[PDB]
Structure formats: structure tokens, C-alpha cells
């Protein structure tokens, strides 16, 4: 009995996303292939965020990812600031900036 | 029991940086991020289906929701990553 996520080539669970789509009151019927798409997109976003955060952590000679590294990774690039414009990250501080 | 994405975020990280770790609070932050983005995309897909007199959410609704939510090249790469998964899963099944 191959799992759906392994069948699709993902790490994130396709079955759990299917269960969350059905019980979440989104549509009357959740056609298959929608959990696969949403799981792939969620995995891509999580992987991109994690890789940028780890790149920020390595540049600081740190072996662990703390909330400050996540805040730096999100605010340091566009299209991730836009996606998370209204989000406050706890224990994340502020971006270093001074005016003339 | 509290369902979390923590078990999957640990394994996804180990593929990129096999040595770095995640503290408890930053993992809570990432879990909230994943739940938030899931909520956004699912709500937009449901609105898309309701707008069109359709009673089902398919991969096309989710694609259009991704194109509406995610900005620019970030949306462009998520569409190609999500289409690769639906294709491979369909052929195997």
C-alpha cells in the first residue's frame, strides 16, 4: 500500500491535506489531484523558506535556525515580504536600517 | 492529539542542510506559516468554485488560487512544482 505522498514524490502528507480539505467546509466535493497540487505547493514554499533561513544561519556561524533567521530571510527578499506583508514573527526583531 | 507539520518540516530541512536544526519556537512559526498559506489557498479556491457555479474543487481551482495568492516568480515556480506532482501521481496511479 504505497502512500499518496510517496506516489507523488513529496514529503508532506497528501492524505492529511485531503482530510483537511473535506472537513474544512470549502466545497461540497473535493476532487482528487487537488491535495496533490496543494501539497506540492506547500512543500515548495516550506522548502524555499527553510533554505533561505538556513543560508542566513550559516552566514552567522550558527548551527540552529532561530526566529531571527526566519525574519531576516523573509524580509530580505521581495515576493516573500509581499506574501508576508501583514505578518508579525515572534522574537524576530526588526531589519537593521538607519536613515541619513 | 495535536496534529502538526513538524515531522515533515524536519525531514524537508534535512535534505537541504543535513546538519542545521530548528528550535522549538521557530518550528512553531513555520507550522503557523504552513497552516496560514493552506488556509489562504483553500479559501481562494473555494471562492473560485462558488463564483463559477461549480460544486467541486479540482487541480485547476488550486492552480488559479496559487496564481492569485503568490506573487510573481514565486507563483511561477509553485505552478511548475505542483504540476509535476499531479502528473507523476496520475501516471503511477
Amino acid at each position, epitope marked *: 500500500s504505497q502512500s499518496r505522498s510517496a506516489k507523488a514524490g513529496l514529503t508532506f502528507p497528501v492524505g492529511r491535506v485531503h482530510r483537511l480539505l473535506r472537513r474544512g467546509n470549502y466545497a461540497q466535493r473535493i476532487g482528487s489531484g487537488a491535495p496533490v497540487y496543494l501539497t506540492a505547493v506547500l512543500e515548495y514554499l516550506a522548502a524555499e523558506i527553510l533554505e533561505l533561513a538556513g543560508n542566513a544561519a550559516r552566514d552567522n556561524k550558527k548551527t540552529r535556525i532561530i526566529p531571527r533567521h526566519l525574519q531576516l530571510a523573509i524580509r530580505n*527578499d521581495d515576493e516573500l515580504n509581499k506574501l508576508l506583508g501583514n505578518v508579525t514573527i515572534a522574537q524576530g526583531g526588526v531589519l537593521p536600517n538607519i536613515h541619513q | 492529539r495535536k496534529e502538526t507539520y513538524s515531522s515533515y518540516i524536519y525531514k524537508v530541512l534535512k535534505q537541504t542542510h543535513p546538519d542545521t536544526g530548528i528550535s522549538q519556537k521557530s518550528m512553531s512559526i513555520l507550522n503557523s506559516f504552513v497552516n496560514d498559506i493552506f488556509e489562504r489557498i483553500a479559501t481562494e479556491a473555494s471562492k473560485l468554485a462558488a463564483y463559477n457555479k461549480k460544486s467541486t474543487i479540482s487541480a485547476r481551482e488550486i492552480q488559479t488560487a496559487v496564481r492569485l495568492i503568490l506573487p510573481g*516568480e514565486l507563483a511561477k515556480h509553485a505552478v511548475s512544482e505542483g504540476t509535476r506532482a499531479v502528473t507523476k501521481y496520475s501516471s503511477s496511479t
Partner: single-chain antibody, 229 residues
Framework: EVQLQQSGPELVEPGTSVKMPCKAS????????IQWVKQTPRQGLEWIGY????????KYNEKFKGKATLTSDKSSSTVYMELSSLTSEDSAVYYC?????????????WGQGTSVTVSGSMDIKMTQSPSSMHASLGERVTITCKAS??????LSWYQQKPWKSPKTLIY???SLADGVPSRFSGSGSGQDFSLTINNLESDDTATYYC?????????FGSGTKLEIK
């Protein structure tokens, strides 16, 4: 559409500074970084550095730490590049190329390039095995780019015609670039990567480069000239 407009050729004496404009149009300036590359016959392609117009953050190849300085003016959508204390080897062609901030992205579009003419062990070595090959008008081709250390899939393939700016073919080692014929196909991961041209053509005569961006300095390939009979 997107074009990275670049100035004309410039001649200058040694010991002097020169500025090159790279105007950007057809897209949002802040979303993408601007990458600078130099091309010579002796050294092939070398990556100088980049600037990110969103936050004006730069990164420099260690060989060009000091010789090249990037500034960006958000008002006129242009990026300037300064070469200082010009020396005999500073003569080459200089391209500005657009890369997105996303890690899977490659140098999508290149500038025309200015011809400037005067009058570091931990790098990723990119070994392109076939230095040249002759082929007929429709068989298949394979070009190999081996990498010394592990780069996961951050490898893209480039075609550069004689006296033209390069064109992107593959990125992320498998994905097909935009507006590229389906016959081109790439493969590989880890250490060994390959490019394949299925139906050869009259318009497929150029030098083919492999580029990696997994590590801190981006190291181009060595080159491969393909002549078709």
C-alpha cells in the same frame, strides 16, 4: 517584454575608471537581481557579482573584490558597474543579466554587452568533457558537465552564438526554459549532468556552456563548440 539595454563599446587608457549602464525595462526592477559576467577567449566566462535593487545588497566574486563596484538607481531602472585601475587583462566583453531572487532561478535574460578594450581554491570546478564535436543534420548529441563538489540541481545550460549574447536553455538541471524547443533536454543531479539535442538543425551551431549557482561564487563551465555539417 524584458530587455536589459546596455551601452556601446568603450576604449580607454590604463589606470582609469569606466562606468557601464544596464537599463532594465519590461519588468519590476526590485523583484530581480542584476548579474554581471565577463567573457574573454583566455578565461571563458567569469561571474563578477550582483546587486539586488530591492535592498541594494551586493555580493562579489573574490577575484573582483575591489576592481568592480555596483550601484543602482531606482529612479531610472539602471544598474551601474565601475571598473577601477584598468589593466591589460581588464579587456573583455561585459554582460548584465537578470536573475530572480528565487534559488531555482537562473540568469534568464542577458544584455547585449559592452566591449571594454585597454591599450580562491574552494571554487566549484565545472568540467565539460567534450571540448568539441562535429555532427550531421538531425542525429542526437550529448554534452556532459561534471562538478567537483555536490551541487544539488542548481545547474543551468547556455547556448551562445558567435557575436551574440547567450541564451538560456535549461535550468534546475531538468526544467526547460521559456520559448525553447522541446528537443533540447537536460538531466542529471549530484555530480554529473548532461544536455541533449535530439533533432539537430542549421540554427544549432554555437558554444554550449554549463553554469552552476549552488555555491558562493558562480562558476561557469569551460565551453563546447559544436559544428554541424
Amino acid at each position: 517584454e524584458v530587455q536589459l539595454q546596455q551601452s556601446g563599446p568603450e576604449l580607454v587608457e590604463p589606470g582609469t575608471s569606466v562606468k557601464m549602464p544596464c537599463k532594465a525595462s519590461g519588468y519590476t526592477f526590485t523583484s530581480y537581481t542584476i548579474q554581471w559576467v565577463k567573457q574573454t577567449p583566455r578565461q571563458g566566462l567569469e561571474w563578477i557579482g550582483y546587486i539586488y535593487p530591492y535592498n541594494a545588497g551586493t555580493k562579489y566574486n573574490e577575484k573582483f573584490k575591489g576592481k568592480a563596484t555596483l550601484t543602482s538607481d531606482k529612479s531610472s531602472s539602471t544598474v551601474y558597474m565601475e571598473l577601477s585601475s584598468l589593466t591589460s587583462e581588464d579587456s573583455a566583453v561585459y554582460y548584465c543579466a537578470r536573475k530572480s531572487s528565487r534559488l531555482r532561478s537562473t540568469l534568464d535574460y542577458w544584455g547585449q554587452g559592452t566591449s571594454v578594450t585597454v591599450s580562491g581554491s574552494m571554487d566549484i570546478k565545472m568540467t565539460q568533457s567534450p571540448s568539441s564535436m562535429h555532427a550531421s543534420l538531425g542525429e542526437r548529441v550529448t554534452i556532459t558537465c561534471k562538478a567537483s563538489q555536490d551541487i544539488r540541481s542548481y545547474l543551468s545550460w547556455y547556448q551562445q552564438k558567435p557575436w551574440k549574447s547567450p541564451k538560456t536553455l535549461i535550468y534546475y538541471a531538468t526544467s526547460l526554459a521559456d520559448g525553447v524547443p522541446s528537443r533540447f533536454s537536460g538531466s542529471g543531479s549530484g555530480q554529473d549532468f548532461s544536455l541533449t539535442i535530439n533533432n539537430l538543425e542549421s540554427d544549432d551551431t554555437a558554444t554550449y556552456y554549463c553554469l552552476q549557482h549552488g555555491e558562493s561564487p558562480y562558476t561557469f563551465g569551460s565551453g563546447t563548440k559544436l559544428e554541424i555539417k
